[PDB]
Design a protein around this ligand. Structure first.
Ligand code: NI
Length: 341
């Protein structure tokens, strides 16, 4: 059964609710982004209307084989009418094609559902600037002050400088980057750009990337592993055994691997600056964990919410435990008292 925090009151609508069967009274299913915990349940046999971004709709059709007649792509930043209700899709600053959804209820209530997002001050000048929001369905992934991490720009600066130094010292070094979903494409694209290479990857991952409307993509990626010195592998293979095995397959072209694991937050963030990050090394293999986040830090979340001043907040992440729920409710009240709404 579909939980209450995936239902939009006063509508026929659900958000990211595809794993519950036919939801009673749902006339349109929204999908915020193509991440498996959110799309869980979709396939070529789905026969209800799905509303989403153009990019999410390319992935639905090509990767999950959802039939074209049930995919309803909407442009961003544009007022649209869906089953009698005005909606707008906004960029969520998460993975490619990820949106927030503004719903204008027939009774005058305005609801924002963030999906998954990384809050940014640039959002304070979207179509959100122009009216009041009553209810906020909020991505609370890192809703605690211990969650700190650097900007995405600082993390990419580290990665590009680290890769360029290594390969210039040793032209026979291979760079490998881990992946298990869409998102974080800048990590491997920025490294391949500084090295003058395309990124080599499997047919299945190449297919996924070709659905993303990234400019000049045919210029940046390839399935010819032999022509590339930046390789993508599944995240599960980014360990000493997995990388040793990959190095064997390269036919003595390379004698060293430098590998990156883009994670979210890890506890080494509470002690170390990005500048000071060091790898794990074994022999000719080094592995860097880099804190490239596509979710709001605590401070970014707090700033967004204090700017928006919602009347009610409904968390969509960490909702399974009473300790988590109580923690989050405490911070929401602090924020409200400090800002005065
Ligand atoms: Ni996500």
């Amino acid at each position: 059964t579909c939980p209450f925090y995936k239902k939009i009151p006063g509508t026929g609508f659900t958000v990211d609710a595809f794993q519950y069967g036919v939801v009673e009274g749902c006339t349109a299913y929204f999908l915020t982004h193509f991440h498996s915990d959110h799309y869980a349940g979709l396939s070529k046999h789905f026969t209800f209307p799905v509303y989403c971004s153009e990019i999410t709709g390319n992935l639905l059709k090509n990767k999950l084989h959802v039939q074209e007649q049930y995919i309803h792509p909407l442009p961003l930043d544009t007022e649209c009418i869906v089953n009698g209700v005005k909606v707008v899709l906004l960029d969520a600053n998460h993975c490619p094609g990820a949106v927030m959804i503004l719903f204008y209820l027939p009774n005058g209530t305005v609801i924002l559902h963030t999906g998954d997002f990384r809050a940014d001050p640039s959002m304070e000048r979207s179509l959100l600037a122009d009216q009041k929001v009553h209810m906020l369905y909020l991505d609370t992934t890192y809703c605690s002050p211990e969650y700190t991490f650097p900007s995405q720009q600082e993390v990419i600066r580290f990665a590009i400088n680290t890769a360029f130094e290594a390969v210039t010292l040793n032209p026979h070094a291979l760079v490998v980057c881990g992946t298990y979903s869409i998102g974080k494409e800048k990590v491997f694209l920025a490294i391949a750009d500084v090295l003058g290479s395309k990124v080599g990857m499997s047919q299945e991952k190449y297919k996924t990337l070709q659905c993303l409307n990234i400019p000049e993509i045919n210029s940046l990626i390839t399935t010819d592993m032999c022509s590339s010195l930046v390789h993508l592998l599944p995240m599960m293979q980014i360990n000493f055994k997995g990388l040793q095995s990959h190095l064997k397959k390269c036919g003595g072209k390379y004698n060293q691997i430098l590998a990156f694991r883009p994670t979210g937050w890890t506890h080494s963030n509470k002690f170390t600056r990005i500048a000071d990050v060091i790898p794990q090394t074994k022999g000719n293999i080094s592995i860097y964990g880099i804190p490239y986040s596509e979710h709001s830090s605590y401070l970014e979340m707090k700033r967004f919410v204090q700017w928006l001043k919602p009347q009610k907040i409904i968390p969509t992440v960490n909702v399974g435990t009473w300790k988590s729920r109580s923690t989050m409710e405490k911070y929401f009240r602090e924020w409200k008292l400090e800002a005065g709404y």
